[PDB]
Amino acid sequence: AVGYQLLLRMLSDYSLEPTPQVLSNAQRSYDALMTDTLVVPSMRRRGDFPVGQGNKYDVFTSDRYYPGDL
Amino acid sequence: PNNLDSNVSQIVLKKFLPGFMSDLVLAKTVDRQLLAGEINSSTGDSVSFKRP
């Protein structure tokens, strides 16, 4: 991945143009590199959402609602 | 001689001797109504008050 990206950013230094197969190889390698950094963050509760009464919360510990964030 | 020490038993009574104690003064004097139930670990770890 790194080599193909460097080659793409460097070929123009020698007055040359890329070819379709090199482009396809670079795209495949870049996709393979990018599939490792994927995270897909999850959306937490709003923080004002009520907690169901079946969760058996405590009245004075402010467990009736989700913490939200921080 | 009579050796009848096996006719008795060693007994430890179910009584506790008194211990030592301290005094609680500072907690009763400092004000508590201002901070009471204003900070929650879920919401954060800091709260602020405005000066006059």
Lookup: tokens for A32? 């393979």
Question: B44–A67: do the CB atoms touch at under 8 Å?
Answer: no
Give B43's contacts in chain A (Cβ within 8 Å).
67-68, 70
All residues at 6 or more sequence positions from A44 whose CB lies less than 8 Å from its CB, including other chains: A66, A68, A69
3-state SS string for chain B: CCCCHHHCCCCCCCCCCCCCCCCCCHHHHCCCCCCCCCCCCCCCCCCCCCCC
- Closest to B44 (Cβ–Cβ): which among A60, A62, A70? A70
